[PDB]
Structures are given as C-alpha cells and as structure tokens.
C-alpha cells in the first residue's frame, strides 16, 4: 500500500528522513536510540548533506553527534557502516590526539566538526532512507 | 491525475493532521505571519497538550525563540490566535513581558520549553503550519 516518505516528526530531505534528538546523551546512547527507530546516526556523504544539516540546525549553537568515530588516533575515522570519511567534506577539529576509554566521536557545532570523548553528552541527528 | 502524494512537502515536519515548518528567517511577527501565508500556511496554533509536547520536543535543540500565532493589543485584552479563537485553558501560561504596552501589540514566542510575551516588532524565527495531504 502507499506510504509516506518519512514517519511523523521526521524531516524529509531528498532520499532521506532526519530526526533531531530531544535531549543530550553520550554517543553510545545516541547510537542506540537511532537503531531502535530502524535508523543510524547522521552520515555525511557530500557537501549538499552538510549544507542541509546546517540549514536545519537553524543557527543553533548546541553540539550534534554524527555517526563518525574511532577507537584512538591510530585508527581512521569511520562511519557506523565501516566506510571512511571521504576527503574535502569537512575538517575534524578539537581533541584529535587523545585516547579516551570509550573512543573519540565527531560532533557538529556552529557549522564546524569536532572530535571529542564519546562518553560526553550532546544532541544527535538520526537518519534513514525515505520511502520513495 | 489520481495518484499518491506525500503528506507534507520536503523540509517540513509531518505531525498528526498537519505539516510544520521551522523557518530560520529572522523577522517581526507581521512579516513572519506574511511568510506563512505565502506558503498556504498560518503561524503555529496550539489546540492541545499533545501539540505543545510535539512543538517543545521538535524545538528543544534550538537556542532561539519562535513566534507563534498568539497575540493581544495590551495587558487588558485576553490572548487570541490569528483565527480569533481564545487561548484554551490548561495548555500553557504566558511568561515574560506581560505588563507592558507596545505600539504594535504583544505577541507570543516559544523558547526554553515555555511561552513568553514580547513586542511584536522584534525579530525572531517562527513556526508555520498547514493541513497535511491525507
């Protein structure tokens, strides 16, 4: 039967559905919440994804976890699906030389992307494919 | 024609019978009202606690205030939506600038998980709403 591209409360953009979290949680809790909704943490494949996300953030100063992480600085930045961060999308600033017990994760804040201890709390964005 | 359509346009949020647009245009209450009208929509109108719960949840990541369609000329008048209907009781209290009189009236905005009163000529984001294609 015919269905809506995205569920209620989500934002439909292009081929995907986006959900902004209602609160700040650590990266692992944020990951768990996207999985319970048959979604994953935000994955940026192009500058157009980053531009839509920043437009949707609507000038918020808060940090938002995305699905990019690494165990320590010897490992490359990977998305939850194991694929690497494609070059020329964004620079990862901040805590890029330290090793934290629960890993280092990326968040977006005021347009720029920062690396931080995964146990710290931030808002997050979930995404899943739209029904098209 | 006779084909299936999406309940809401892209960049809007579908909730219940309506579509919501959280516009990041920073304009006064009258210009924000005008922009909603140009999109076949009106400024946000909250009819139930479920509407307020959805709105507060949809804007808790935002640090900025959002105009809604509630207003009054001055403190002697009750709060009224764009359609002339009153603020139904047991929904929310309006905090902030509730004793002053501004030349272009007083308008309400939502922020901090709460509704505040402010001078209508001031600039803020706004929430538009229209009926979903159901």
UniProtKB/Swiss-Prot annotation, chain A:
Site feature (Not glycosylated) residues: 45
Effect the entry attributes to changing residue 12 to A: Abolishes binding to acetylated LDL (AcLDL), probably due to inappropriate homodimerization
Oligomeric form and interacting partners: Homodimer; disulfide-linked. May form a hexamer composed of 3 homodimers. Interacts with HSP70. (Microbial infection) Binds to the head and beginning of the coiled stalk of N.meningitidis adhesin A (nadA) variant 3; binding can be abrogated by monoclonal antibodies against the specific regions of NadA. Binding occurs in protein microarrays, in solution and when LOX-1 is expressed on the cell surface.
Residues of the full protein shown: 139 to 270 of 273
The species this protein was found in: Homo sapiens (Human)
Induction: By inflammatory cytokines such as TNF, IFNG/IFN-gamma, IL6/interleukin-6 and by pathological conditions such as hyperlipidemia, hypertension and diabetes mellitus. Up-regulated in atherosclerotic lesions, by oxLDL, reactive oxygen species and fluid shear stress, suggesting that it may participate in amplification of oxLDL-induced vascular dysfunction.
Protein name per its UniProtKB record: Oxidized low-density lipoprotein receptor 1
Disulphide-bridged cysteine pairs: 6-17, 34-126, 105-118
C-type lectin domain mapped to chain residues: 13-127
Localization annotation: Cell membrane; Membrane raft; Secreted
Result of changing residue 6 to S: Abolishes sorting into the cell surface and binding to acetylated LDL (AcLDL) while increasing N-glycosylation
Residues bearing carbohydrate: 1
